[PDB]
Symmetry: C2
Subunit: 362 residues, 2 copies
């Protein structure tokens, strides 16, 4: 007996196109999404070139429309040069992303004053997301208060961070956050097995106490999102390992295992992979769209999942219970038992749908 | 014709006793203070042992009462172990100091949650000061708002920081700040001359644009304070140079030069070295206490000033106009033209004066 879920949404994926297509592209990344029960993704802007102006966004939109197999929205990225310049294209994007810790030259912000300028200039009704670790979470929360608006904090990984967000919410501040599966299901205890190269991710893997704190504070977590950050094994095992893990194909199976063990409910899961992503990012419903999962099937995560070009996974060897059996996207069968059945280009930009525009005052 | 000033206050000095007395002690540091026209100092807690509990404070109080030549108050320091333990001695201290960036093991805080615990437990009517650089200023401001109280930011050094504080003040937040003379009178342009060892200080020397921003934003600066941080030349020129500059003997001459050039007024100076320190830290007046200065005398800063055991200065070679001629402290001549005339032990703990206790609700 299969369980029918709505079409799940991952608001944080790196699909590497343009410019890193050996790591992943729209076609491979969205195949990975569908196999993981995800029917809509929001793609991050740290591509090459990065999506930091209108021409780069226009290119990315066409690459996505031609390559995506599931539906999508594309983030714009904040730079040291583009505050006050994105107003005409802002509404066509998923939102604006600020990289406040380690980043590529083009997305580096060298001053909190630049963060303020973005919060002041980006349209007030549109989403802003920050990669912010440790005290940077407190800092960007301050900037959000000074500019009187909301902020979404990406991949919370530490007890310190989730307790700070909890305290902010207790004071009624408009902050939401997400947590990635590797910060719920891996810790320092796994670095031995992974090694210093594969184990490289940002935010870094937490202690057992960090992991326990995130579970204890599940009520504070608004969304789950993969931070799918594909890099090849050659890159991860090399001399200058880039941070990041692939995660689209493993996220839902890991979380379904946790549901089966009673660590959270099916509803808790659907709030965090469907309802809260919709409401925070103003993402539209998808008609005739659903995912069928088998909660009984026990399997072991292999050395690589079938679709991501990353061709490795940090969850290798973990036992899971829960499998995606079928995905239907807008009335077409998109995935069955290991086979993707919609072509590159089937996916659409949800921000171009009438129901996908963010409502605003005239 | 000499100008009579009130007794000036430096709220940020490191006098190194106990535990670093080769660098400075209470007797030498307060001689330096008097020679710089300073009649009251607030001593920082990063001594050895650091002033992080009642026994250490008790020892420091006796060392100061025996050695100080001018009046003083002593800070307590926040640690990872002492939140909630300082209530009985808190009122006897200048305030509580948090070291939020680089620090010794004992004063290191590893989580913003620890900062919050201190803001929640330290008595609400007593001062809290933070060493906070760059985004750390935004972070500690957030903690101050979450806990609904004030904070004083030490040595603001950058355009980024002063503009952040300016924006916070425009929103009516209870934040004050101070700037040190090296961040007004030295910059990157001086690193050539100083070298990488002598030039080591935290916050680091700013760009010319940072320096210009602090002057342009003088209205935002509540206090001047030296951050007198004596280290010997051997230490500064050695393989692991500690950060910090000596500054008590040079601060007032540098600032008087700026007054003579019309860069700020005499009143602007007295607000920042007398009135605002009194009101922010609830420091009492000193009876029959005053400083006589000569604003006409031009001289060149030598390779070392007479009193600090640091026996070097980063201002060597700068031309100044303005000299301290006489200091009277509580009715006794304390300093005349290069000679200190009150003995170690003349100085008193102002927090023990009836007028030096901080008023509170019963
Ligand atoms: Zn990130
Ligand atoms: Zn990311
Ligand atoms: Zn400091
Ligand atoms: Zn200091």
């Amino acid at each position: 007996k299969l369980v029918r879920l709505p079409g799940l949404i991952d608001v944080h994926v790196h699909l590497r196109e343009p410019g890193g297509t050996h790591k992943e592209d729209f076609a491979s990344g969205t195949a990975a999404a569908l196999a993981g029960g995800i029917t809509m993704v929001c793609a991050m802007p740290n591509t090459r070139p990065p999506i930091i102006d209108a021409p780069a966004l226009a290119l990315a939109q066409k690459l996505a429309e031609a390559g995506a197999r599931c539906d999508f929205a594309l983030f714009l990225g904040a730079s040291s040069e583009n505050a006050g310049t994105l107003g005409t294209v802002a509404g066509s994007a998923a939102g604006l992303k600020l990289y406040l810790n380690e980043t590529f030259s083009e997305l580096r912000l060298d001053s909190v004053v630049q963060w303020m300028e973005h919060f002041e200039t980006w349209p007030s009704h549109l989403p802003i997301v920050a990669h912010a670790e440790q005290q940077t979470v407190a800092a960007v929360l301050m900037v959000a208060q000074l500019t009187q608006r909301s902020v979404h904090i990406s991949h919370v990984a530490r007890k310190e961070e989730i307790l700070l967000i909890k305290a902010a919410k207790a004071r009624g501040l408009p902050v939401t956050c997400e947590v990635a599966p590797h910060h719920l299901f891996l810790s320092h205890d796994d670095l031995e097995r992974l090694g210093p190269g594969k184990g490289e991710v940002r935010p870094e893997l937490g202690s057992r106490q960090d992991v326990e704190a995130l579970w204890e504070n599940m009520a504070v977590i608004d969304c789950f999102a993969s931070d799918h950050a594909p890099h090849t094994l050659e890159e991860k095992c090399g001399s200058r390992p880039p941070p990041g893990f692939p995660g689209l194909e493993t996220m839902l199976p890991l979380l379904l295992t946790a549901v089966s063990e009673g660590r959270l409910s099916l509803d808790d899961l659907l709030q965090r992979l469907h309802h809260n992503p919709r409401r925070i990012f103003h993402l539209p419903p998808q008609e005739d769209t659903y995912v069928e999962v088998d909660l009984e099937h026990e399997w072991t995560i292999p050395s690589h999942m079938p679709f991501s070009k990353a061709h490795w996974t940090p969850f290798e060897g973990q036992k899971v219970k829960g499998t995606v059996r079928r995905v239907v996207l807008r009335g077409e069968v998109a995935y069955i038992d290991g086979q993707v059945l919609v072509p590159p280009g089937y996916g659409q930009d949800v921000r171009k749908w009438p129901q996908g525009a963010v409502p605003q005052l005239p």
